[PDB]
Design a protein around this ligand. Structure first.
Ligand SMILES: COc1cc2cc(c1OC)OC[C@H](CO)OC/C=C/[C@@H](C)[C@@H](C)OC(=O)[C@@H]1CCCCN1C(=O)[C@H]2C1CCCCC1
Length: 128
């Protein structure tokens, strides 16, 4: 399935190269710019714990998720991963707990030391 494909084939986009955030580009975007710290970013996504159990999707709010990139308003792996993406791109990320909610986790959605999987669609990004 999607996560195994990432484990097996995905690129390690961490600085430390600790395989904490792996990425596969599933749909190539158009345009060359990937967004900078402080950019306002518009996405669709779906996420799940790597072993099923809990699930979340922007389409469940019928609206894109919007955040400010690189300000830690999202988990580290998103600040890292979404910055590598181009407008129109769809990507798969698989994330170790260290770039997500660590050992403390976050009930009720997230257990301790959870690995997470997302599909992210970068819709757009604007300057701050
Ligand atoms: C730990 O709690 C949650 C985790 C997740 C979703 C989430 C949530 O409740 C706060 O609720 C949906 C909420 C609004 O209804 O989404 C806004 C994005 C929140 C940002 C503020 C943080 C908490 O979420 C994230 O950083 C990441 C990356 C962006 C998208 C949401 N994501 C999640 O961790 C998901 C989580 C993914 C695994 C499956 C369970 C939900």
């Amino acid at each position: 399935g999607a996560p195994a494909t990432v484990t097996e084939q995905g690129e390690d986009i961490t600085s430390k190269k600790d395989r904490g955030v792996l990425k596969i580009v599933k749909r190539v975007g158009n345009g060359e710019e990937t967004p900078m710290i402080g950019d306002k970013v518009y996405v669709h996504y779906k996420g799940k714990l790597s072993n099923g159990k809990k699930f979340d999707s922007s389409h469940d709010r019928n609206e894109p998720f919007v955040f400010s990139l690189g300000k830690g308003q999202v988990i580290k792996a998103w600040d890292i991963g979404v910055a590598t993406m181009k407008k129109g791109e769809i990507a798969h990320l698989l994330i170790k707990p260290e770039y997500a909610y660590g050992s403390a986790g976050s009930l009720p959605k997230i257990p301790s030391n959870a690995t997470l999987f997302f599909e992210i669609e970068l819709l757009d990004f604007k300057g701050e």
